[PDB]
Design an enzyme around this catalytic site. Structure first.
Site, PDB file in Angstrom:
ATOM      1  N   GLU A 100     -59.160  -5.169   2.639  1.00 15.34           N
ATOM      2  CA  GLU A 100     -59.821  -4.077   3.334  1.00 15.34           C
ATOM      3  C   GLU A 100     -59.761  -4.270   4.835  1.00 15.34           C
ATOM      4  OE1 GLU A 100     -60.646  -0.891   3.669  1.00 15.34           O
ATOM      5  OE2 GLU A 100     -61.941  -0.976   1.917  1.00 15.34           O
ATOM      6  N   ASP A 153     -60.414  -4.922  -2.167  1.00 16.91           N
ATOM      7  CA  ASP A 153     -60.971  -5.354  -0.882  1.00 16.91           C
ATOM      8  C   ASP A 153     -60.600  -6.735  -0.524  1.00 16.91           C
ATOM      9  OD1 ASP A 153     -62.108  -2.968  -0.228  1.00 16.91           O
ATOM     10  OD2 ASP A 153     -63.847  -3.288  -1.590  1.00 16.91           O
TER      11      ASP A 153
END
Ligand SMILES: Nc1ncnc2c1ncn2[C@@H]1O[C@H](COP(=O)(O)O)[C@@H](O)[C@H]1O
Ligand SMILES: [Mg+2]
Length: 177
Positions: free
Chosen positions: A59, A87
């Site tokens: 992310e 992420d």
């Protein structure tokens, strides 16, 4: 005594975080000056990812670099390639992680995320602003104090929002993805 959520974001988040969040909004044609509850949510979710991370951050990266990093891990390790772009990667437990931060019920959000990603391998870890959390298989990955530090930061954001009269709107504005 209702403040500006834009000014709150630029004052209470680290500028590296704010710049990543603006970059992420502009990529999807959302304006940080307009869609400000979204801007705040984005920054919050970035800050949690950075606090959580042993770990490769996914992310926050440009999409071409994020997929390069994902592919590079997947073709180095056994790992199934995600359909979306998680992420983090956990080099210890050898798995990708999807992190969520929600202002709604944590089970609701968790199952939305599970249903979107349709993976048996990607671990999901959801935090709420109430201090509730839910993680895949009740495996919480990080130790108690590391998770408590994340919950504490969420409370600090909430109270600082409240202080500006921004919480009411922020907490009511989350929709399903
Ligand atoms: N670096 C980022 N880039 C894009 N969206 C982000 C970022 N950090 C947080 N977000 C937002 O926070 C959540 C991140 O999406 P997800 O990673 O699917 O939970 C969604 O609300 C995103 O729109
Ligand atoms: Mg993400």
């Amino acid at each position: 005594p209702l403040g500006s959520m834009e000014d709150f974001v630029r004052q209470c988040f680290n500028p590296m975080i704010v710049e990543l969040a603006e970059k992420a909004m502009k990529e999807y044609g959302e304006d940080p000056k307009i869609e400000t509850n979204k801007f705040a949510a984005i920054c919050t979710h970035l800050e949690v990812c950075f606090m959580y991370s042993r770990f490769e951050i996914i992310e926050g990266r440009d999409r071409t670099m994020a997929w390069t990093v994902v592919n590079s891990i997947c073709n180095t390790t056994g790992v199934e390639k995600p359909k979306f772009l998680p992420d983090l990667y956990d080099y210890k437990e050898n798995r990708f992680i999807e992190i969520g931060v929600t202002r709604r019920e944590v089970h609701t959000y968790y199952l939305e995320k599970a249903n979107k990603i349709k993976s048996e391998k990607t671990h999901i870890h959801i935090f709420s602003f109430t201090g509730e959390e839910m993680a895949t298989k009740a495996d919480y990955t990080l130790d108690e104090e590391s998770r408590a530090r994340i919950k504490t930061r969420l409370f600090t954001i909430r109270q600082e929002m409240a202080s500006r009269g921004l919480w009411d709107s922020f907490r009511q504005s989350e929709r399903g993805e």
